[PDB]
Ligand binder design. Structure first.
Ligand SMILES: N[C@@H](CCC(=O)N[C@@H](CS)C(=O)NCC(=O)O)C(=O)O
Length: 220
């Protein structure tokens, strides 16, 4: 257990990602929580560039950046189920969409909370909605009618996108908007249950109300 350590704030969509990947690979690990109010020495020494989590420590050796960590886990524990797609083009598409999520979509939805007016706030909600339209189409293309972005089995892009699901639901609730519905994102609605119910996910997947109540705690 001790030769695999995961440094992580909790709850966090980025920290969830390697927990799921480690679950898929049936890998034994110790979870070292970063607590509010302080950055640990281990953190400051493991991730001096960004001073954030997750950090996977594999043999006293730090791997930073959640998506990089998921690929590392997939490559090292190659015995287990595959996380990335096997085909180069499918892998490129999965990486493209995970990058879009982290660079454009999630930052936009995280900015809703800080908008300075109702005008600008709905502008962001509309963009988050449009992004979900794009992701619904990506899901159709990636899944091929099977259950996940990865196809029959959960995959890299399921982990990247699904890790945000609890925060999407909390932002939906606290803004009184419905961004996933059966009209605009029918496939994602179904996948959201497939993902949250998955045995590699369900025990690390946040209750929506908990995230809402937690958002309220952070307001400081
Ligand atoms: N982009 C990073 C995640 C960045 C991030 O914002 N991490 C926060 C989420 S709460 C965190 O827990 N950082 C550790 C800390 O602040 O103590 C990744 O993909 O690895």
């Amino acid at each position: 257990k001790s030769d695999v350590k995961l440094l992580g704030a909790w709850p966090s969509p980025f920290v969830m990602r390697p927990r799921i990947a480690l679950n898929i690979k049936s890998v034994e690990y110790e979870f070292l929580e970063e607590t509010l109010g302080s950055k640990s020495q281990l953190l400051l020494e493991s991730n001096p560039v960004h001073k954030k989590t997750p950090v996977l420590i594999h043999g006293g050796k730090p791997i930073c950046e959640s998506l990089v960590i998921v690929e590392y886990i997939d490559e090292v524990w190659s015995p287990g189920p595959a996380i990335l797609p096997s085909d180069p083009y499918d892998r490129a598409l999965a990486r493209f969409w995970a990058a879009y999520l982290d660079e454009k979509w999630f930052p936009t939805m995280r900015n809703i909370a800080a908008a300075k007016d109702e005008e600008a706030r709905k502008a962001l909600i509309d963009q988050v909605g449009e992004g979900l339209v794009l992701l619904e189409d990506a899901f159709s293309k990636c899944s091929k009618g099977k259950g996940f972005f990865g196809g029959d089995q959960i995959g890299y892009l399921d982990i990247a996108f699904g890790s945000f699901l609890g925060w999407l639901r909390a932002i939906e609730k606290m803004n009184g908007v419905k961004l996933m519905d059966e009209t605009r994102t029918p496939g994602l609605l179904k996948w959201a249950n497939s993902f949250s119910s998955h045995p590699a996910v369900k025990d690390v997947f946040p209750e929506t109300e908990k995230l809402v109540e937690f958002a309220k705690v952070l307001a400081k």
